[PDB]
Amino acid sequence: MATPTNAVSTVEINGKREDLIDIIYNIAPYDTPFMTAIGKGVATAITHEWQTD
């Protein structure tokens, strides 16, 4: 009751707009160490073949 008796406060008014910020906070990691480490190349067929000795 620690409010003036006939006082217009945020409790009894209506139509207050919401406060939603325009930022989405995402910090999930998506790095690929092994992909970055190894080499890249081109394959020209379904099966890729090589030789060892």
Partner 1 sequence: ELRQPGKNTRVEGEDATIKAGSFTTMLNNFCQISDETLQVTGTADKVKKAGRK
- Cα distances (Å, whole numbers) of residue 2 to 6, 9, 12: 12, 12, 15
Closer by beta carbon to partner 1, 2 or else 45: 2
To the nearest whole angstrom, how small is the minimum distance from the Cβ of residue 28 to partner 1? Answer: 34
Closer by beta carbon to partner 1, 6 or else 47: 6
Cβ partners under 8 Å of residue 41, min gap 6:
none
Which amino acid appears at position 17 of this protein?
A: R
To the nearest whole angstrom, how small is the minimum distance from the Cβ of residue 14 to partner 1? Answer: 5
Closer by beta carbon to partner 1, 15 or else 33: 15
